[PDB]
Design a binder for this molecule. Structure first.
Ligand SMILES: *Cc1c(COP(=O)(O)O)cnc(C)c1O
Ligand SMILES: *Cc1c(COP(=O)(O)O)cnc(C)c1O
Ligand SMILES: *Cc1c(COP(=O)(O)O)cnc(C)c1O
Ligand SMILES: *Cc1c(COP(=O)(O)O)cnc(C)c1O
Ligand SMILES: *[C@H](C=C)[C@H](N)C(=O)O
Ligand SMILES: *[C@H](C=C)[C@H](N)C(=O)O
Ligand SMILES: *[C@H](C=C)[C@H](N)C(=O)O
Ligand SMILES: *[C@H](C=C)[C@H](N)C(=O)O
Lengths: 389, 389, 389, 389
């Protein structure tokens, strides 16, 4: 006995259905199929006694549109709850703010996203928090570097920009044994390819700017928590730091998330073909893509990646820095020369120009974000650029 | 000589590249990869003499964000130019307002979208314009029905809600011989499946509300004209009728159009499987889908549809009206019971309750718009509803 | 016995309170003090039987945000109901579309807004509708020009750009005697200065673009009807023409309307001072402003205008067209040289350059929209411009 | 030589002109009178060498719409530069993050906004930063409380919710002598009433949520710095913390700031009349408003407030807590029972329920934010509620 507008009780929607509908139901007041945008700072209360009945009071603390996105994101990533932020850096910084105090130690991948690196070094370390950067490719490095003061192990997989993988299940096992928080930044992967919470991570951080948005439209971040205790700590501190996502951003991301599976499938199919083309090009010294046989962590890629190997790839042009620069300066449309990644629009950048040599970022190293354009235009443009290297 | 930011000279970008990038280059002032939203009524002029240098004066007439969308739409549909409107109905009535005058005769598909039918009968016919509704399935019917006062032949394909097809190329040949304007509403098809301007139509009308948007987010319309003379008449009259699209809607549509190929591929693959499922179901009386082998206009569908047979299908439940209604009252989530079509969210519609019998709209007749959810959830939901019917 | 969140029963809110709160109450579901933006095309129905319970089905026909604005506008203008449109021209054109048929006659002010003029002449007259342009300054001209075929008398007061007044109560008396519809465009006045429905008009048309918005942000129109029968006709035809306002525009206008009284008071105080300054300047041949003693319809202005004499003024520079042009070309910031009016930003334009001499628009004639800047900057800028005339 | 579009050289525009036009010129590309919304994540670079020519790379770092708002805010507040943030709390915590390090002492008003108090105690003090809450009413208290480790003196004026004043100029003289940073939160005052940078403060923090917005529409924060060195530290750290304002919020705030002078004039005139009414009411125990003659810091208010005494007031109901609660449960529309302040809509707040006794926040203590409704409706509503108390 269930009617139009109910899910059938006892059934779990399958993956692509969750991207379309998770966290959202038609508006109860009007039936609007999309939740309205609560572009609104404050919420009227029925009486002094009934404060917070209806659930809301002030949009810095929580907002209904933002909360619909958080419910969707928690379902997609497999978490107890999620908090959404103005940016991915805000999400990351809130984890550092909540879980570290002076005297604590934090292990971070040495090939982090650069911003994560700069916020650790140039900011939180003034609170006498010890950040140690290590090679997460071997989990025993993590196990050996954990101290009694270690509170957080912060992995990223694939890693910005070298696309190293971290074995998330094994690191989680180590972190569970040592009772330390395992935080994983899986922005490059997407939950469609890898869900760190499924593999035992305690927290996931996402830049929703990148693939969740996928359109170069909005900035955003999310923290997805494995437990209520962690979630409530993140939520409380978000209210204090004032870095919640806005209702309009959340509306845009509720919309673009619906297509994340078909976008990432297309981007990943394009990236596989581009990586194969570059691996045969004589001006190209090395290609990094988890889907080609030369990838050094192929075994882990096949264990840890679902569905696809992602839209990110990297390569090194022969001839070092001058050659990388000539190539960049001649990459034609439809490519865009710019920062960011994950978008329908294909993007290329040179991480070093825009030492570093021990992090993998060699002289002619190029990070490529593959979009959903026709792959022949993308390949023709790279081939032209490489003719100038 | 080609540098970053230039297209390779002498290359036509491929189709999916045009969906991503058509009509848009990075902002010249800032490099912004998306054009900014010109949420702005009026445009400052540098002098009386240099009036309309920079090209804009007032947003009812033209607006830069709307103009970017129009360039993209004209490129995708293969037209000389496009005009964007607040809604598909505004686009349609602007065509009727511009190209019909008292004493004129207009042939319309008798299976027209019901709105198009009702603006003709209940509104424009008070101006002594004669609208004749005829069966467009056989082009010879069109040729035979043309009269000395015929000015417009207004086809639609597939037709709302019965999915009858019209042979656009054959009708265009007839219209070209008799010197009559051919207008085609290809809302249900999408330029990814069928481009009437390639098949000889003089004008295309689109409800961008449906598939161009594809997210239940915005209303919009577009008129794509084969020639400059037609385009300039539409543009002039849009300014007079005050029914242009807004900048914010144009921005949303510029974003959602980038994924139209992958969305329509996913929706159409889902629709093919749903239509096969329904065609085998013992409580289903008839199934209409241009891609299943029993489709009555199979030969024209294979000639006229490019990649897919679309996301729309229709079927009738055995047991007549009471069974159709019981079925629709029990269709569970992920389905939505509502009007409209074309969206990521799958939609089930009852065309009678949201004579009718003469041209297909039967008792238990159900119009289905297939979204991008997991097809197995969609089928599970219909199978539940059918078992309750 | 009434509590927080109720109006006291039996009391009518006063004028400025209606601009702040009319048509809107906190969201029942969340208490949001502002209504959320229903950026949403379609609305899910509970069952086939309960179609249109909850009130909505499709945003071309009606949308909740748009309806909140319509309720506010109907209260502010004193009408039974209001319909909102994509633009003021759409509102006007819908009145012509609904109330005129071939053979009918329509009286229109000869100093109309130009667009109204061009849509009558260059478009509706092809339906054999006879538009006659007359001098509304004397009501007996209206009474003498009414024919048995006259269905609409269309007044505008103050008139674009000459600021002639029409005696709205007297014209209404004439129209009631002859049983013809009196439609008044009171865009230049605002309901804060004159409510034609209070003076017996049957319909008001507004470009909400101008003062209701007041920020050069959105386009919009409204039709406010004196009766249910008129309202329902406008509503039905809006659904057919597809020219409804969007939810986002309605949200912007729900916000900017809150300040219309304080904006228009400031603009009107500035305009009075500017008009006094120009009336003494030796390069200025004539100044038109209802608040200065030289205004020809001063008696009617004092009868018909409440609170203020408005933010619009006009003047003629000595030396004809070349002098008007030199002046325009040298009007400095904070002035903007552009079309439109009613905004926080002061705007100046020359109507003729951008015969006409019998409509009042003389050679050196300048239409001025006064904003809310400091009046000394505005006057200093005009004085500088006039030194170049 | 000055032409349309130029300011007169050597003239400082007056204050209300800067609210309308500060930081914004017509779009160079199109003449758009409002800057377009750069709803856009990343910015295309023309070459490796010309990196950050055009001035933008990524919206977390800087965005053109946000930068226009920052220029306007810096002009209005009288600063070298401004940084805009997602919220006022983000602005505040960015100040604490940049200018405090372990071992540092910080003096804060004991009547600080409660959020500011709770980010200090419950968060930054875990970094061995000592926050001391002292009575800022007498500047000598500040001078006496400074210690060798004092780095920041953080004043607020008027204070949330008690409306205590701090003598900003005297405190700035003390801070300049002791070489200590003076930060002033003048959210309640608005730059129209009081500019701390003019009174010697080193930094101003604003919740733009409140009066800059004034419409309950957006969240936002701003930090306005007296020097380049301070501004560059704030900017660098905003990029690291990921808490910048978004382009859409900056667009709303650019619009709402244009009317801040006339809004605050209207709200303050209403608040003066409400405060006089309350001061005469037999069920009112105490009334706090800086403009009524019994205000305890009347002399400083007359020295420090420019045009108005603001829209905030507070009062206590006779009969203690039960009476205050009965009163608030019966305050009718147009009042809203909720958090926040500064808006067109009048708001009544209970600060305890939305120790406290030591610094003013008594039993029946009610915080009132006066909007721009008709003052007689506002008073009628309070008089009804008071009669029920
Ligand atoms: C971009 C990014 C971030 C930072 O997110 P923003 O949204 O840019 O603040 C963090 N981690 C990774 C892997 C990232 O790519
Ligand atoms: C929906 C539709 C229309 C009308 O478009 P709106 O955007 O709803 O005004 C016209 N033709 C077809 C085939 C349609 O489906
Ligand atoms: C501007 C105007 C119009 C047209 O309104 P739009 O919003 O520009 O379509 C109609 N009447 C008057 C008096 C006007 O000023
Ligand atoms: C509201 C407020 C804040 C915090 O600003 P948010 O925008 O709510 O984060 C800081 N100071 C005062 C005085 C405030 O009123
Ligand atoms: C980070 C820029 C600060 C950006 N997302 C990138 O990786 O390019
Ligand atoms: C038309 C509603 C008036 C709608 N697009 C439909 O066909 O459902
Ligand atoms: C009309 C332009 C077509 C505009 N509102 C004006 O009067 O300037
Ligand atoms: C703060 C809520 C956390 C709010 N601006 C208030 O003081 O009401």
């Amino acid at each position: 006995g269930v009617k139009a507008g109910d899910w059938l009780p006892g059934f779990t929607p399958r993956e692509e259905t969750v991207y379309v509908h998770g966290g959202v139901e038609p508006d109860p007041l009007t039936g609007a199929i999309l939740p309205p945008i609560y572009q609104n700072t404050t919420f009227v209360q029925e009486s002094v006694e009934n404060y917070l009945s209806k659930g809301f009071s002030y949009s810095r603390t929580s907002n209904p549109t933002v909360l619909s996105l958080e419910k969707k994101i928690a379902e997609i990533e497999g978490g107890f709850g999620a908090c959404c932020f103005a940016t991915g850096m805000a999400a990351t910084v809130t984890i550092f703010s909540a879980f570290l105090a002076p005297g604590d130690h934090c292990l971070v991948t040495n090939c982090s996203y650069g911003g994560t690196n700069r916020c650790a070094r140039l900011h939180f370390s003034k609170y006498n928090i010890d950040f140690e950067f290590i090679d997460f490719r071997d989990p025993t490095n993590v196990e050996k570097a954990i101290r009694p003061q270690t509170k957080v192990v912060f992995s990223e997989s694939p890693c910005n920009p070298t696309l190293y993988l971290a074995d998330i299940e094994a690191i989680s096992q180590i972190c569970k044994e040592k009772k330390v928080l395992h935080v994983c930044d899986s922005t490059f992967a997407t939950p469609y390819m890898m869900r760190p919470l499924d593999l035992g991570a305690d927290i996931v951080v996402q830049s929703t700017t990148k693939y969740y948005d996928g359109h170069n439209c909005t900035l955003g971040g999310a923290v997805i928590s494995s437990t209520k205790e962690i979630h409530d700590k993140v939520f409380f501190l978000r209210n204090v730091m004032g870095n919640i996502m806005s209702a309009q951003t959340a509306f845009y991301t509720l919309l673009t998330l619906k297509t994340l599976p078909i976008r990432v499938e297309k981007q990943s199919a394009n990236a596989q073909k581009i990586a194969e083309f570059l691996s045969k090009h004589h001006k190209v010294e090395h290609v990094i893509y988890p889907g080609i046989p030369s990838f050094p962590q192929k075994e882990l890629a096949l264990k840890q990646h679902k569905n696809v190997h992602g839209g990110m790839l990297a390569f090194e042009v022969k001839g070092g820095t001058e050659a990388g620069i000539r190539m960049m300066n001649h990459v034609p449309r439809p490519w865009s020369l710019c920062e960011s990644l994950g978008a329908c629009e294909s993007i290329i950048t040179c991480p070093a120009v825009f030492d570093r040599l021990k992090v993998g970022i060699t002289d002619g190293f190029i990070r490529v974000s593959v979009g959903i354009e026709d792959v022949n235009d993308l390949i023709d443009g790279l081939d032209y650029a490489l003719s100038k290297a």
